[PDB]
Design a protein around this ligand. Sequence first.
Ligand SMILES: C/C(=C\c1csc(C)n1)[C@@H]1C[C@@H]2O[C@]2(C)CCC[C@H](C)[C@H](O)[C@@H](C)C(=O)C(C)(C)[C@@H](O)CC(=O)N1
Ligand SMILES: Nc1nc2c(ncn2[C@@H]2O[C@H](COP(=O)(O)OP(=O)(O)OP(=O)(O)O)[C@@H](O)[C@H]2O)c(=O)[nH]1
Ligand SMILES: Nc1nc2c(ncn2[C@@H]2O[C@H](COP(=O)(O)OP(=O)(O)O)[C@@H](O)[C@H]2O)c(=O)[nH]1
Ligand SMILES: [Ca+2]
Ligand SMILES: [Mg+2]
Ligand SMILES: [Mg+2]
Lengths: 440, 69, 430
Amino acid sequence: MRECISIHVGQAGVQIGNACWELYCLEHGIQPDGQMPSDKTIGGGDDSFNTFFSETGAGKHVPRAVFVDLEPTVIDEVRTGTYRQLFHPEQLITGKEDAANNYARGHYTIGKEIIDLVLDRIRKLADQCTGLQGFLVFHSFGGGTGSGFTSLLMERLSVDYGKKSKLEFSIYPAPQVSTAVVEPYNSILTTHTTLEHSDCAFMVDNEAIYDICRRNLDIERPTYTNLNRLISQIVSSITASLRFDGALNVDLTEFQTNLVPYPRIHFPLATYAPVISAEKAYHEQLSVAEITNACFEPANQMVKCDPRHGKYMACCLLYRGDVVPKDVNAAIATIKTKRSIQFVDWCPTGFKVGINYQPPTVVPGGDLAKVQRAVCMLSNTTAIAEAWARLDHKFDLMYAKRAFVHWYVGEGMEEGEFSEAREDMAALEKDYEEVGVDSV
Amino acid sequence: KREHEREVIQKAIEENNNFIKMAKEKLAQKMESNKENREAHLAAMLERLQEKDKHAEEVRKNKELKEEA
Amino acid sequence: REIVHIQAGQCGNQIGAKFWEVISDEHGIDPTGSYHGDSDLQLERINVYYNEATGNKYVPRAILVDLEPGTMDSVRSGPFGQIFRPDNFVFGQSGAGNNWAKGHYTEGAELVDSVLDVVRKESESCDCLQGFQLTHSLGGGTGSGMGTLLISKIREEYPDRIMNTFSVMPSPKVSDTVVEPYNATLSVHQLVENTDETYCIDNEALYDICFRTLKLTTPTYGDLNHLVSATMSGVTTCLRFPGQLNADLRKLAVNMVPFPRLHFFMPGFAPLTSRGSQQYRALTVPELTQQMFDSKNMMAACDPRHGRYLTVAAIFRGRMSMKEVDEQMLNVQNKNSSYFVEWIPNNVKTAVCDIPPRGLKMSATFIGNSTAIQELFKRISEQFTAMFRRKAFLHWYTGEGMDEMEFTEAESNMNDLVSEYQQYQDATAD
Ligand SMILES: C/C(=C\c1csc(C)n1)[C@@H]1C[C@@H]2O[C@]2(C)CCC[C@H](C)[C@H](O)[C@@H](C)C(=O)C(C)(C)[C@@H](O)CC(=O)N1
Ligand SMILES: Nc1nc2c(ncn2[C@@H]2O[C@H](COP(=O)(O)OP(=O)(O)OP(=O)(O)O)[C@@H](O)[C@H]2O)c(=O)[nH]1
Ligand SMILES: Nc1nc2c(ncn2[C@@H]2O[C@H](COP(=O)(O)OP(=O)(O)O)[C@@H](O)[C@H]2O)c(=O)[nH]1
Ligand SMILES: [Ca+2]
Ligand SMILES: [Mg+2]
Ligand SMILES: [Mg+2]
C-alpha cells in the first residue's frame, strides 16, 4: 500500500477536486463527516482505499489532498460546503489576490509569496506516509494559478522529492467556457516548464467534454458542474486500480510502463464509455462489446483529435464493474477485424487490460445513468499532437504582434522565455512526428 | 561484475542528484532574473512620475517669475 | 476585492452621484446605508464598492472632489447625498474656470494633497485593494486637469494597482466653451501614459442617441446622464456580482488591453427605443445582440465598421437562454468576421448576469477596444489644431506657467495614438 497525494491548483483544479473527492467518498462508503462504517480498523489500516485516505483515531477518513488557490473564494466554498468536515483546515490554502490570468503572476509575483507554505503543508502529508508513491496534480492550462503556480510547484517538488512520480490532470482550454484571451500563452508557458518534471499527463479538452455533455447527455448549455461530474468519472476510472484491489486489477504504474515510450511522449488520450442519460439507459443494457467499441469512436475522447489519422504506440483498457475476460477478449477480437488501429512498427499491438470489479457510482442529482459496467481506454497515439498544433497556432498569431506580452514583461518575464517555450513546443510536435515514421 | 553493479547504482544516484541540483539552480536564477526585471520596470515607472513632478514645480516657478512683471 | 471611487469636478460628480444611486438600488441599499433587499447575491460582492460601518450600514468607498463647492452641495442635497462619508468631501473654493492648467498645475495642485489624505485613509482600510476608478470630464478644468494630476499622484503611491477612468469627451453639440479641445487634448496626453483602462463617454454620441433615436429635441444633461449611468452599471456588473468573466479590474484589463497605450474603450448599451417604437419592438436575444453591435448604440461617436475590434466584452443581464446568447454571439462574429482582427483568436468574451437593471427584463452592455476609436481622437485633434494654429487663447495657459511645447507634445502624442490604432487596423495575420 503506497500512498498517493493529490494537489488541486486554482479554480479548475479545486472544483474538479470537489467532484472527485465526493465521488470517491460515495465509491468507498465514506460519509460527509469522514466516518466509514465498513472500515473495522480504527485509526489506521493498509486497505486499498488507504492509498487516498488517511485515518484519525476518531474514525475520520481524510483525503490525502491539498487544495491551493491564490484567491479565497473557490476554496471558501469547500470550507463551508457539504464536505467541509472531510478536510483539515490546513489542507485548504488560499491567498488574497489571484494571478489575473497571467502565468507570470502565478509563477513569480504572487506565487512566490505562498509556495513555501504550500510545500510545508505537502510535507506534512508526505510525512504521514509509510511508502509514498507520488503526486497527482490537477490544474487548468488557461488560468494564471493553474499554469504559473503549478509550474512553480512542479519544479519545487522535483527538488524536494527527487524523481518521485508526478502525474497531471490538465484542463486544456475551449472557447465555449474560456475566460481569457491569453490562455494560449499560459498553456505553452506551463507545458514548456512542466514537461521535464512530469511523468505522465492526462489532458482533458474542455471542448471534448462540453460536446459530450451536449450530445450524449442532452444538456443544452453545460456548466462547470456538468463538465466536472463527467471528468471525475474519468479520473475515477484511472485511479480505481489504486483505490481497489482485485484479481484482474492491474496497477496504474503497470499501464504507465506501456504508455510512455520516451520521457517526453507522456500524454495519453483517454476515451470513456458509456456516457448516457437515465432516460436512455432505461431498459438498455450496454454490453462489454458495445462500450469497448464506443472506445474507438472519436466523439467519446477527452481530447479532440483523430486517431484514425495517426499511429498507436499503446492501447490500454481499464474496465470496471460486471466484466469478465472472455467478453473483453471477444470484443477486442471483433474490433481488431474492423477498426482503424495502426500501430507504429516498433511496438507490439496487444491491448493491455485491467478489470476492477467494483461497479461505477454516480453522484445524486447528476446527469449520468448508473450503469453496470464502464471502460476507460488510455491510448498513446500520435494524434494527440493535434491538440498542441491548435494551441501553438493561436500562440503564433498573437505572439507575432506581441499582443498582451507587456502584461508578462511587466511582471518580470522576458520575450526569451516566450520563444524558448514555443521552440520546446515545436520540438515536441516534431517528436510526435518522428515516433510515427517507420524504422529504416 | 560486482564492481560494475556498484558503478550502475552510483551512476543512478549521481544522475538523480544532478537533476535535483540543476532544477534548484535554474529555478533560483529564474526567480532572481525576474525580481530584478520587475523592480527595474517599477523603478522606471516611478522615475517618469517623479520627472512629471519636477516639471510641475518648474511650471509653477515659471508662473511666479512672469507674475513679477 | 475593493475599488476606491473618485469623482472630480462638475461632470465627474453628477455622473458619479447617479452611478451610486443606480448601483445602490441594484444592491438593495437605501439612502441611509441600510440593506433592504430580497436576494443574497446583492450582498455577496458588496464590499467591492461599499464599506460596512457600525449598524450594518453600507458606505460608498467614494471620494468627492471639486475646486468649487457648488456641485458637491447639490450632491449632499441629492437623494443619496446622506449616504456618502462626510469626511470624503474635499472641495476648494478658488475654482478652475474651465482651465486645465489651473486644475493640473496651480489651484488643483494646492488641493491635491488633501485629496490624497482621504485616498490613503480609504486604501489603508482595504483587505485587498484592486485599484481606482475616476469619473470626470475632459472638457472642463477640475475634472480634466486635477483629475489627471490626481491619477499621476495615485500611481506614484500605488504603482501596482489598476487605474480605471470614466472620461466624458467634449462635443460642440453639448457645450459652448471654446477651450474644450485644449483641455481634452492635454487630458488624453495624461491618460495615454497613466491609466490602465479608460471608458470613452463621448458627449457627441450621447447627444446623437438622445436626439435621433430617443427623439428628445432638447436633451438635458439629465438625459445624457441616464445613458451614462445605465452604461456604467452595465460595465461594472462583472465586478459587482458573482461571475466568471472579467470579475476584477486586472482580469478585465488583461482581456481588453493587448498593447498598453491602446486602452480606450467604446461602450454600448441595449436596448435603446423611442417611446414610439417601444410598443412594437420585441426584446429578444437576437435583437439585443444586433443592437449592441450597432453604430447607433455606441456611447462613443465612432463607426465600428470603419475599423477593427482588437477585443470585446459583452454582458447580458436578465433571465434568458444562455444557449441562445451563445448562438447569437457566434452568429455576430461569423457574419461580421472582417471587423475582428484575425491575429487575436477568441477575442470576444460573453458574460450573463441573472439580475437585470431596474425597469428592464433584459439588457446588454458592450465594451469594445476598436481601432475605430481613432475617429474620436481625430475629431478632437481637428478642433485642437484649428485653435492652436492661431495660438488662440493660449494665454490662459501660459498665464499659469506652461510653454507652447507641452501643447505640441500633447498633440503629437494624440496623433501617435491615432497612428498606432491605424497600424493594428492594417495588420494582417500573414
Ligand atoms: C425602456 C427602454 C428600452 C426598451 C424596453 S422594451 C423595448 C423594446 N425597449 C430604455 C431603458 C434604458 O434605461 C435606458 C438606458 C435609459 C433611457 C432613458 C433615456 C436616456 C431618456 O432620458 C428617456 C427620457 C427616453 O428617451 C425614453 C424614450 C423614455 C426611454 O424609454 C428611451 C429608452 O430606450 N429606454
Ligand atoms: N473543466 C473545468 N474547467 C474549468 C473550471 N474552472 C475553470 N476552468 C477552465 O480553466 C481555465 C481558467 O483557469 P482557472 O482555473 O479558473 O484560473 P486559476 O487557476 O484559478 O488562475 P487565476 O484565476 O488567474 O489566478 C479556463 O479554461 C476555464 O474554462 C472547472 O471547474 N472545470
Ligand atoms: N454627460 C455630461 N457632461 C457634462 C455634465 N456636466 C458637464 N459636462 C461636460 O463637461 C465639460 C465641462 O466640464 P465640467 O465638469 O463642467 O468642468 P469642471 O467642473 O471644471 O470639471 C463640458 O464638455 C460639458 O458638456 C453632465 O452632467 N453630464
Ligand atoms: Ca482502517
Ligand atoms: Mg482563479
Ligand atoms: Mg462646468
